[PDB]
Design a protein around this ligand. Structure first.
Ligand SMILES: OC[C@H]1O[C@@H](O[C@H]2[C@H](O)[C@@H](O)[C@H](O)O[C@@H]2CO)[C@H](O)[C@@H](O)[C@H]1O
Lengths: 131, 131
C-alpha cells in the first residue's frame, strides 16, 4: 500500500487535464490509475495489464463494476518512466498514452467534479499537475 | 474541504525533495502545508501567515503541538503563484522559499519516512514532484 498514492479533495471540473508521471516497476504485471469521487465511485478505472498485453478501462459505482473496455494498444514497458494525461469531459475521458496514442472512455457517472485519485500496483507516481 | 488537497501513502525518504507549486488565494490571511505520518502526526507544519507577516513552522504529535518557530521572511503576496521545495533529512527540514531563502526546521517526530501531505487555507496546490 506504500507508494500506492491516493489524492483526496481535488476539484477536477469538465475541461480540466491531469498529467501524471512516474516509473513502472521492474517485474510488475500491471498497475491501476483510479479517478472519481471516491473509493466507492470510480468514474475512470485505468488498468494497463502487461501480462495480458491490454489496457482495461472500467467504471465503479459502489460495489458494481461497469462493462470493461479493453484497448489492445499497450505500447510501453515495465521498468520505464512514462507520462499519462487524463482529460475530464462531461461525456468522456481522454487518456493520452506515453506514445501519443489516445484512449477515450465514456463518463458513465454524471458530470460531478472529480475529487479522488488513487494509484495501485507497480506505478510510483513522481509528479502530478492539475489544470 | 473542497480544494484542501490530501496526498496519502507517499514514500518520501531521508534525502528526498518535494517541490510544490500552487496559487495563493486573494486576500487570504494565510495557508498551510502539512508534512508527516498522518493527520495527527505532522513532522512539518508550514504556515505562512500574511496577517502576521511571518511564517510559522511547528510539529504535531497526536493532539500535542510543539513550540512554534516563526521566520520573519514572508516575501510573497496573495494572488501570486509561489513554489516551495522541501528537502527531508533525518536531522531537519529545509524549505527553499520562492526567492531562494532556505528555512530549517527540526524533525521532532523521528526519521521515519514521510507519507502524508495536506494543504489548508488559501492555497490551491496545482502540482507536486517527488525526487
Ligand atoms: O473490471 C476490471 C476490474 O475487476 C477485476 O478484474 C476482474 C476480471 O476482469 C474478471 O474477468 C474476473 O471475472 O474477475 C476480476 C475481479 O472481479 C480486477 O481485479 C481489477 O483490476 C479491475 O480492473
Amino acid at each position: 500500500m506504500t507508494g500506492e498514492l491516493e489524492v483526496k479533495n481535488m476539484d477536477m471540473k469538465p475541461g480540466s487535464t491531469l498529467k501524471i508521471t512516474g516509473s513502472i516497476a521492474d517485474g510488475t504485471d500491471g498497475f491501476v490509475i483510479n479517478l472519481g469521487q471516491g473509493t466507492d465511485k470510480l468514474n475512470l478505472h485505468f488498468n494497463p495489464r502487461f501480462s495480458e498485453s491490454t489496457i482495461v478501462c472500467n467504471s465503479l459505482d459502489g460495489s458494481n463494476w461497469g462493462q470493461e473496455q479493453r484497448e489492445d494498444h499497450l505500447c510501453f514497458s515495465p521498468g520505464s518512466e512514462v507520462k499519462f494525461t487524463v482529460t475530464f469531459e462531461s461525456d468522456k475521458f481522454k487518456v493520452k498514452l506515453p506514445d501519443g496514442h489516445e484512449l477515450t472512455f465514456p463518463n458513465r457517472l454524471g458530470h460531478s467534479h472529480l475529487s479522488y485519485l488513487s494509484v495501485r500496483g507497480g506505478f510510483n507516481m513522481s509528479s502530478f499537475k492539475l489544470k
